[model samples]
Target: QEGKCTAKGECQENTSGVKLFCTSGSCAKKEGQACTRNGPGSSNSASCPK
Candidate 1:
């Protein structure tokens, strides 16, 4: 699945120095941290769905 984001919000980074990739309303990462809905900048945009 491809990654995307909307205008309402954004899938942000959870851990420090780590990047978050938005994929079908979820965030995908390799290591260093886990993605959540309320961890630091973890708010994701629900508008970007496909």
Candidate 2:
């Protein structure tokens, strides 16, 4: 997949009759980047300044 995109964003598939629209909020990290499933609970990092 040369044009494969994993980032969250509006993307169109070249397979025809396929369209994807993603909002900016979808880029929020859930459980890997900052938030993680630790032994106690989630380790949420400080949110970025708006």
Candidate 3:
């Protein structure tokens, strides 16, 4: 649904300018709720189920 990222290892910006990320081990849009893949950004944390 809603183009969520369900612990899919890493995420991508399939929705053009928008991005995808995991939240609480679940999937959610980066509409302010962004989750990085590599570096742990000060704003958004990372979730790599790899």
Candidate 4:
């Protein structure tokens, strides 16, 4: 499963417990890029840096 993103820094967690976010309409797989995921046991939310 996948979650929807509205902007470059938006994020959602999948069914596999993996967090993903949007970047130019696509998802980012790296940190410090478009979005960021917390470490294990952390939150699943992502944020955009201004």
Best-fitting candidate, scored by lDDT: 4
Worst 10 residues of 1 by lDDT: 29-38
Q: Which stretches of candidate 3 lie over 4 Å from their true place?
A: 1-10, 13-24, 39-50
Sort by lDDT, top down from the best: 4, 3, 1, 2
Kindly give the stretch of ten consecutive residues in candidate 2 with the minimal lDDT sum. Answer: 32-41
Deviation from native of the Cα of residue 43 in model 1, angstroms: 19
Top-TM-score candidate index:
4
lDDT of 4 by residue, 1-50 (tens): 33434345345554444544433344433333344444435544444443
Measured with C-alpha atoms, the lDDT of residue 23 in candidate 4 is 34
Better of 2 and 3 by lDDT: 3
lDDT of 2 by residue, 1-50 (tens): 10122344323333342323333323232222221111212431122112
RMSD for all candidates, in order, please: 10.8, 13.0, 8.7, 8.4
List the candidates' TM-scores in order.
0.20, 0.21, 0.23, 0.26
- Candidate no. 2 TM-score: 0.21
lDDT per residue, candidate 1, 14-49, as tens digits?
A: 334333445454433233223343222564332223
lDDT of 2: 0.27
